[PDB]
Design a protein around this ligand. Structure first.
Ligand SMILES: NC(=O)c1ccc[n+]([C@@H]2O[C@H](COP(=O)([O-])OP(=O)(O)OC[C@H]3O[C@@H](n4cnc5c(N)ncnc54)[C@H](OP(=O)(O)O)[C@@H]3O)[C@@H](O)[C@H]2O)c1
Ligand SMILES: O=C(O)COc1cc(F)ccc1C(=O)NCc1cccc([N+](=O)[O-])c1
Length: 316
């Protein structure tokens, strides 16, 4: 399978990238170095992950070593919720650029559709624990993202955790200058996302699947929770193909024409997760994996459920 997918900005995006949420700052530099050494050319980052400086050290060292050229890398970051204001977007992007030690991003995403009050706190709360919203709407934030393209800071812009009505709002924006290139959403066999994926793909928006392994290290995991990596039905498909369960879980979105961004800081697993271009799941395997959908969503916060732009009240 081809390694890259064509975006609606004319650039090609590697379909496999390395995730970095929860990668400890003292480990992520070596994780990214190993990833680049073993073939990764796409790194998924965010300011809110608090480790972009350390990701950047790795990128810069591999560029300096001439292991890769900058044009061969595809670096993604995301605008955090406390920066949706017009006057804050450029500085937020520049802080990410300076931390990653880059002079442009390949892709910059609105991280969540929900804007929060600016300030030092990433989740400003009222005394009852509700997030304090911003009044800047997804369309004005989008216009600020478009400016970043026109200033040369980013090659492509997109969105993340937008439901189909929110995607449609962007696509219907009066005076829209650049369509979103990507919508990055949670997607795995327990949250298969058929409706939202079909909508985005029909509009030429590439979908990136996050938490493809079910985020077993998410901080709010409970013992009662389903586990993709331990699901015997998925293990059986992996055994048939002489692959690991993780390799099946990564190949699955690839065959749906999605980009996928598994996270690891374990060198062996970073290598394992990349060895997914040499086997094929059958149509029957794909439909079987899709059948495991339980609308089991791991990434969504109680503190945000009354925000006007909370994305997950809508069916999709
Ligand atoms: N846009 C958004 O709102 C959003 C939200 C969530 C995630 N994301 C992005 O998507 C990335 C991936 O999602 P995620 O971090 O939630 O979780 P994930 O990639 O589904 O799972 C990561 C977990 O799986 C483990 N793992 C990795 N490879 C494995 C393998 N071969 N065998 C067994 N265990 C393995 C990792 O352990 P070790 O690291 O210990 O090896 C880690 O505990 C994030 O890091 C972030 O970049 C974006
Ligand atoms: O948002 C991600 O990329 C991963 O999850 C996080 C990463 C962080 F470093 C810090 C927090 C989160 C987190 O709680 N992310 C979840 C989240 C964020 C914003 C809005 C909502 N919402 O439901 O509207 C949910």
């Amino acid at each position: 399978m081809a390694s890259r997918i064509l975006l609606n900005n004319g650039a090609k995006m590697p379909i496999l990238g390395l995730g970095t949420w929860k990668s400890p700052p003292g480990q992520v530099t070596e994780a990214v170095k190993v990833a680049i050494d073993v073939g990764y050319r796409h790194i998924d980052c965010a300011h809110v992950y608090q480790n972009e400086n350390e990701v950047g050290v790795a990128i810069q060292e591999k560029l300096r070593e001439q292991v890769v050229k900058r044009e061969e890398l595809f670096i993604v970051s995301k605008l955090w919720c406390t920066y949706h204001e017009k006057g804050l977007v450029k500085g937020a992007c520049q802080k990410t650029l300076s931390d990653l030690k880059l002079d442009y991003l390949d892709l910059y995403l609105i991280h969540w559709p929900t804007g929060f009050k600016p300030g030092k706190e990433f989740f400003p709360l009222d005394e009852s624990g509700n997030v304090v919203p911003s009044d800047t709407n997804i369309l004005d934030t989008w216009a600020a993202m478009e400016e970043l393209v026109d200033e040369g800071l980013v090659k492509a812009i997109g969105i993340s955790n937008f439901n189909h009505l929110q995607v449609e709002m962007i696509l219907n924006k009066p005076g829209l200058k650049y369509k979103p290139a990507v919508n990055q959403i949670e997607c795995h066999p327990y949250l298969t996302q058929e409706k939202l994926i079909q909508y985005c793909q029909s509009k030429g928006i590439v979908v990136t699947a996050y938490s493809p392994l079910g985020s077993p290290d998410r901080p709010w995991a409970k013992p009662e929770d389903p586990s993709l990596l331990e699901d015997p039905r998925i293990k059986a498909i992996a055994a048939k193909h002489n692959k690991t369960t993780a390799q099946v879980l990564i190949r699955f979105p690839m065959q749906r024409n999605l980009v996928v961004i598994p996270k690891s800081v374990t060198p062996e697993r970073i290598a394992e997760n990349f060895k997914v271009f040499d086997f094929e799941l059958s149509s029957q395997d794909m439909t079987t994996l899709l059948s495991y959908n339980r609308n089991w969503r791991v990434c969504a916060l109680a503190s945000c459920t009354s925000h006007k732009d909370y994305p997950f009240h809508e069916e999709f």
